Amino acid sequence: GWKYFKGNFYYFSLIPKTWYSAEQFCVSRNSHLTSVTSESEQEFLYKTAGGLIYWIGLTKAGMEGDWSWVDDTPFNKVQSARFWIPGEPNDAGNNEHCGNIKAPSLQAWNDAPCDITFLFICKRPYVP
Ligand SMILES: CO[C@H]1O[C@H](CO)[C@@H](O)[C@H](O)[C@H]1NC(C)=O
Ligand SMILES: [Ca+2]
């Protein structure tokens, strides 16, 4: 049940997993938890999510706790600012080092604890 959008296939899971178990599942299917690199991709993702919470490829990297994409897409702090829910990321309990799609809006992302289980979204490139 992979959905096709702009050169990539996407898997919206039916089973919830911790952030890392999710990523491992994605990697087992030749994919990664999804990156988000445009307004149109964000829109495709939150709309397809239909108001449910899905882990995406957001996770912390380096000593500074900068956000990064697990698929190694460079994280663009400037261009991604409009994608977080107002007030996020907020590192609640100093233990929110992974990110999910939460609100059905362009401002969709929340940081949550990595060990919480949620549905998840894998992204796999199509290579002709
Ligand atoms: C009450 O905390 C929840 O909502 C806040 C924003 O109010 C979020 O910042 C926070 O991450 C989220 N917690 C979880 C576990 O998802
Ligand atoms: Ca948060």
CATH of the domain at 89: 3.10.100.10
How far, in Å, CA of 62 to CA of 56, rounded? Answer: 19
Experiment type:
X-ray
Quoted resolution (Å)? 1.9
CA–centroid distance, 63 to ligand 1, in Å, is 23
Nearest ligand to the C-alpha atom of residue 91: 2
Structural domain range at position 74: 1-128
Q: Token pair of 83, please? A: 């994608």
What's the structural domain count of the chain?
Answer: 1
Which residue has the CA at smallest separation from atom 7 of ligand 1?
87
